[PDB]
């Protein structure tokens, strides 16, 4: 029995293991929706207004995941300002702040979750009122500074109540440079939905050609009326890949008002000169769907979910939740012995 002090590592391993099992048991039950497209100037923007208008859910917890981001923005902003004070040789209006400045470097490692004693708040209020700090803020175009720096520091009263709920505009302000992804953790009909709006296309084919597999649904955005043959080639390559034989393609033909006007004035033949149908929505949409689905050639079933949509009043949540439920049911029956 070579257990000597060692019969302690196993116990640790079993506690870590239990933790890994518990997060894992909960996860994987999430319904994940992947949005792709953006092959145009503004597709995901159209997606964003439809999301704003027809999608919601702001529990306390989703607002809470932005707490660390708010704090990090604030701390990094004040750090940037202080460092610029050192760089530009700006002195305190009152030499007693030199003591604050020593504390400042200490309180700068105090950047933990939600340390907002009245003393720190007063130090920040005093710095923000300083003329050299105001001078830096008004010269912020020469360095990097959140545009909302003054907005928040001037709003500390509103910001510090424990019932603060970030607005939608607050979220829009959360700064995104090169990568995004959109997340929500709302509850609805006892299902936890997770919806992801991704862009970055026109070049990231390799990320979906094989990085995705097992996802619940694809949402493919197409610019109806906004080179083109290369797009058909990319879709052919992705669409017909043997590893994606069993994955559903769901199509939201968006900007339908402009498309309906364009097909009145712009023939479908610009894209497909061999098209002999009429320039009605139904025939042109059916023809496009046919051209895409014909690229498969290796699948007896289709289960394509086609939708007929209207204006800003369209009951979207009913439509989205019915489609989620039918796909989950058919995907639960497919592997329960019944067929």
């Amino acid at each position, epitope marked *: 029995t070579l257990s000597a002090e060692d019969k302690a590592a196993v116990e640790r391993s079993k506690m870590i293991d239990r933790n890994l099992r518990e997060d894992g048991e909960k996860a994987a039950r999430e319904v994940k929706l992947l949005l792709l497209g953006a092959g145009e100037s503004g597709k995901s923007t159209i997606v964003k207004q439809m999301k704003i208008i027809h999608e919601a859910g702001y529990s306390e917890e989703e607002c809470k995941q932005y707490k660390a981001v708010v704090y990090s923005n604030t701390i990094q902003s004040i750090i940037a300002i202080i460092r610029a004070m050192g*760089r*530009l*040789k*700006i*002195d305190f209006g009152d030499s007693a702040r030199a003591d604050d400045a020593r504390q400042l470097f200490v309180l700068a490692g105090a950047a933990e979750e939600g340390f907002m004693t009245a003393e720190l708040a007063g130090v920040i209020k005093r710095l923000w009122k300083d*003329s*050299g700090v105001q*001078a830096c803020f008004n010269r912020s175009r020469e360095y990097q500074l959140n545009d909302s720096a003054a907005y928040y520091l001037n709003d500390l009263d509103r910001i510090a109540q424990p019932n603060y709920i970030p607005t939608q505009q607050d979220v829009l302000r959360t700064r995104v440079k090169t990568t995004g992804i959109v997340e929500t953790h709302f509850t609805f009909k006892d299902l936890h939905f997770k919806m992801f709006d991704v862009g970055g296309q026109r070049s990231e084919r390799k990320k979906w050609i094989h990085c995705f597999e097992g996802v619940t649904a694809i949402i493919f955005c197409v610019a109806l009326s906004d080179r083109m043959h290369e797009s058909m080639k990319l879709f052919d390559s992705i669409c017909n890949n043997k590893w994606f034989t069993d994955t559903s393609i769901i199509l939201f033909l968006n900007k339908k008002d402009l498309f309906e006007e364009k097909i009145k004035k712009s023939p479908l033949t610009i894209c497909y000169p061999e098209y002999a149908g009429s320039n009605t929505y139904e025939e042109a949409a059916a023809y496009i769907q046919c051209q895409f689905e014909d690229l498969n050639k290796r699948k007896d079933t289709k289960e394509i979910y086609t939708h007929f949509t209207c204006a800003t009043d369209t009951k979207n949540v009913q439509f989205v939740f019915d489609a989620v439920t039918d796909v989950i049911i058919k995907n639960n029956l497919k592997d329960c012995g019944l067929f």
Partner: antibody
Amino acid sequence: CEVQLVESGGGLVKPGGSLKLSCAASGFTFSSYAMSWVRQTPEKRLEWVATISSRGLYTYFPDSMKGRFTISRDNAKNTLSLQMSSLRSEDTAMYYCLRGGGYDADYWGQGTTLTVSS
Amino acid sequence: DVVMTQTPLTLSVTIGQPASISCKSSQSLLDSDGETSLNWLLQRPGQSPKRLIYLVSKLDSGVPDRFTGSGSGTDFTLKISRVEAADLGVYYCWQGTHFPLTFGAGTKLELKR
């Protein structure tokens, strides 16, 4: 108002004498910008004079000349002044006052001439 | 000796040929923040000295792109792709890293008659 840089005080001074140069800067944030003085000898050799911070709490002077030149600044006229005593032959030079410090001296003043001869 | 050397001291250059002048500082010019206090300056006879290059790579406003500063530590290089009439004067590399500030020897560029 208007960004103006006026230098004054230059001329001829006898050995061992004293003279007060003054540079007035207006039209910009004098209080939040540093200031510099630079001398150019007639032998095309540039020699540094002084550099003072935006608020004047930190001043850098050469040690070989400390005790001879005195620098001061007034916010009432936004003007820097420098008094020189016990001048030397090499102090016969063209003096420029510059907005900002060594890390932000982008604009050069007009300057004035100082000549020393017995 | 305290050497703040710009090399070569005197060069005859053909009209249009690029010029490269090296700047060597007696002490390292890196501060604690990792930055470089370097200015490339031109002083013309009868006119106020004009800054040519700031922060080695940030070109000053209104300065032609022909002036390019490069280098690190005590090894600096100022490059002019095309020598023109406005380039006349004395060239200086000026450091603000160490106080008191030190001025370079300079390169005297003038047009041959």
